[PDB]
Amino acid sequence: MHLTPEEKSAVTALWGKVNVDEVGGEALGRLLVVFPWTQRFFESFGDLSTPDAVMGNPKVKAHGKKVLGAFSDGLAHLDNLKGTFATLSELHCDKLHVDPENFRLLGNVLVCVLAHHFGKEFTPPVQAAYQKVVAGVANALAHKYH
Amino acid sequence: MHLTPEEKSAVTALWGKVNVDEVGGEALGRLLVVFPWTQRFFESFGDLSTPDAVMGNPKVKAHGKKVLGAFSDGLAHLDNLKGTFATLSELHCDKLHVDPENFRLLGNVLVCVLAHHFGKEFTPPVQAAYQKVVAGVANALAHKYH
Amino acid sequence: VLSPADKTNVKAAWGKVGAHAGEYGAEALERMFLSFPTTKTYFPHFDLSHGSAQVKGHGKKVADALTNAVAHVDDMPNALSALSDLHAHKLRVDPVNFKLLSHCLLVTLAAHLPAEFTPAVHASLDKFLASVSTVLTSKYR
Amino acid sequence: VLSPADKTNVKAAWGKVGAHAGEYGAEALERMFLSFPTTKTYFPHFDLSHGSAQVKGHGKKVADALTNAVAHVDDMPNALSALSDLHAHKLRVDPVNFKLLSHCLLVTLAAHLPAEFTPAVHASLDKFLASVSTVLTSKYR
Ligand code: HEM
Ligand code: HEM
Ligand code: HEM
Ligand code: HEM
């Protein structure tokens, strides 16, 4: 996590404009659609058979919001991601058994989601700041795996 | 490193039995043979047209010894690989233009050479400690890229 | 493998790119250079400054090739043979870098085609870029 | 693409494995579990302790499939159809993991087949495990 002050201001300014409810649902839904293997964790979510069935599934939307919820909190402690994410890291490992590669796929999808939403505002340099951030978060979420 | 005193001792103790001359030559040559594209940096070495030509090439063997040399000295600063490889990190970036992914390919080749050499002695637990070191070394070497 | 659906998706999204392919190619490169600086090791000879003509020049070349693979979506291995040879034998780009560019291309398209960049399209474009990458790397060893 | 030399190299090496393939299967898993603990996420239901019969049994299973693959080196896609299915639609292991088991398998062969683990054979086996990996993840999406 080598965020220059200017990189950090940039992450923060844009994050100001995000509707976490919305972005959360889109990012999670899109993950389940682009990398269908990730659907292995959600067999209790119901019908994920098509893009519409996934994108519109009330359970996917509610889970996405939860996920991005935790992520946003992460963005207020950019200094201590490991600390911030420690109980979650343990849970994902020990209870959920989620392969950490999942955290990197989601980060990439999120970046595409932000690009989708902000258009031209998501400049090369802003993308580069966010790239560092999703990686820092994925690393923090994997820190307690054993 | 995130090496356990026990993990540190395992690494340390096997290394003591290593012929850097031979292991260095073999690791680099195997690299050039398994992952042919790494030959892009060694055009001046000559004929690498065949396994035999690679394994026999003295320029290869001598470069191999230089590399394991430096690696070998890094095992003495296992608690600060970053500071040990800083200058070497800049060199590799700014002068040589070597993609850090290469550092990871070699690491894995290195592990295969050690298993090759030590058979029985190279146990799952010992491999585990070595995997952490090779990863650690690769990270240190890639640290100053920009 | 790409399904009929995928093929339709790709031709459609790429259809919209039209005449901006060149600029979108250049943009994906810059994004790549900024986000994954290790990719720069392959262009030691380029001016990577903002608005570099070398980058402009190169973005067009990449875009033309992608455009050529879309045009020959049913025979990509053959449409891209030459480029597959170049990459395997001369350039010798480590395979991991293809995924990085792909990623930056997807970000670029997303940033420019909001109406078309649907989940379905996104998925198709991702499988497509993966297939191009596979072709370009097929003759490596 | 496996060259004829490669197919030969592979068949030779695997030839020497013989009645120990099961043990080597088991040993490769154990090395994978310890070196890459993230791989354990796919075996929550197993006793991953050293010498576990679950691990042993699974080791045989994997080893056997490799055998069958060497045997049908010419028609892998077909020989492993079912396995490609299982992995793509049921197990859904992330593709990155295949490279980790492949590596633990080389290490294991190397440690047990000193004379046979020459540089050329090493290159062939790698390519082979790579091909096997491609086959197993070809129907993922
Ligand atoms: C930014 C990365 C992520 C964050 C911040 C995050 C956060 C969360 C939170 C806050 C919960 C609820 C905790 C609880 O139940 O006590 C949760 C649960 C869960 N997460 Fe994650 N998550 C992330 C990524 C993922 C990914 C990528 C996957 C799978 C591909 C995943 C799989 C799950 C599952 C399966 C649950 C439990 C759902 C249930 O209640 O059945 N998570 N996550
Ligand atoms: C274990 C990781 C590595 C270490 C510790 C390492 C270390 C070294 C050292 C100590 C030198 C001597 C150069 C000098 O001081 O001027 C060197 C040079 C060099 N290394 Fe690395 N290296 C590593 C990995 C690699 C890899 C994987 C490659 C490419 C496959 C590579 C390519 C080169 C090249 C091309 C040179 C220049 C040699 C010459 O001048 O002909 N290195 N390296
Ligand atoms: C799907 C992805 C890619 C496509 C379609 C592509 C296509 C091309 C094309 C059309 C050229 C120019 C060949 C000529 O001179 O006619 C080229 C050159 C080149 N590419 Fe690739 N490429 C891809 C991926 C990559 C990646 C990922 C890298 C490294 C990060 C890379 C590095 C290079 C380099 C260094 C050159 C030579 C440039 C010069 O000296 O002018 N390529 N590529
Ligand atoms: C080298 C490539 C691989 C081969 C040839 C292979 C082969 C097999 C075979 C033969 C089975 C048993 C099928 C049955 O039960 O009838 C199996 C199951 C399984 N494989 Fe794969 N596998 C490979 C890679 C992987 C990897 C890398 C992972 C995860 C890290 C994995 C995870 C699993 C799991 C979790 C099972 C089910 C175990 C059980 O519940 O009994 N496989 N695989």
Curated annotation (Swiss-Prot), chains A, B:
Keyword list, A-Z: Acetylation, Congenital dyserythropoietic anemia, Disease variant, Glycation, Glycoprotein, Heme, Hereditary hemolytic anemia, Hypotensive agent, Iron, Metal-binding, Oxygen transport, Phosphoprotein, Pyruvate, S-nitrosylation, Transport, Vasoactive
Phenotype when changing residue 139 to D: In Geelong; unstable
GO biological process, one term: cellular oxidant detoxification
Annotated phenotype, changing residue 68 to P: In Mizuho; unstable
Effect ascribed to mutating residue 129 to V: In La Desirade; O(2) affinity down; unstable
Impact noted for substituting residue 146 to Q: In Kodaira; O(2) affinity up
Post-translational modification S-nitrosocysteine, affected residues: 93
Post-translational modification note: Glucose reacts non-enzymatically with the N-terminus of the beta chain to form a stable ketoamine linkage. This takes place slowly and continuously throughout the 120-day life span of the red blood cell. The rate of glycation is increased in patients with diabetes mellitus.
Consequence the record notes for mutating residue 121 to G: In St Francis
Outcome when changing residue 81 to H: In La Roche-sur-Yon; unstable and O(2) affinity up
PTM sites of type N6-acetyllysine: 59, 82, 144
Impact upon substituting residue 10 to V: In Iraq-Halabja
Effect of residue 6 to A: In G-Makassar
Effect of residue 24 to D: In Moscva; O(2) affinity down; unstable
Residues at which (2R)-2,3-bisphosphoglycerate binds: 1-2, 82, 143
Effect recorded for residue 11 to D: In Windsor; O(2) affinity up; unstable
Oligomer and partners: Heterotetramer of two alpha chains and two beta chains in adult hemoglobin A (HbA). Heterotetramer of two zeta chains and two beta chains in hemoglobin Portland-2, detected in fetuses and neonates with homozygous alpha-thalassemia.
Disease annotated for this entry: Heinz body anemias: Form of non-spherocytic hemolytic anemia of Dacie type 1. After splenectomy, which has little benefit, basophilic inclusions called Heinz bodies are demonstrable in the erythrocytes. Before splenectomy, diffuse or punctate basophilia may be evident. Most of these cases are probably instances of hemoglobinopathy. The hemoglobin demonstrates heat lability. Heinz bodies are observed also with the Ivemark syndrome (asplenia with cardiovascular anomalies) and with glutathione peroxidase deficiency.
Protein name (database record): Hemoglobin subunit beta
Annotated organism of origin: Homo sapiens
UniProtKB/Swiss-Prot annotation, chains C, D:
GO cellular component, one term: haptoglobin-hemoglobin complex
Consequence the record notes for mutating residue 102 to R: In Manitoba; slightly unstable
Effect upon mutating residue 6 to N: In Dunn; O(2) affinity up
Outcome when changing residue 129 to P: In Tunis-Bizerte; unstable; causes alpha-thalassemia
Post-translational modification: The initiator Met is not cleaved in variant Thionville and is acetylated.
Annotated consequence of substituting residue 115 to D: In J-Tongariki
Documented effect of changing residue 141 to H: In Suresnes; O(2) affinity up
Name used for this protein in its record: Hemoglobin subunit alpha
Keyword Acetylation appears in the UniProt entry: yes
Annotated consequence of substituting residue 139 to E: In Hanamaki; O(2) affinity up
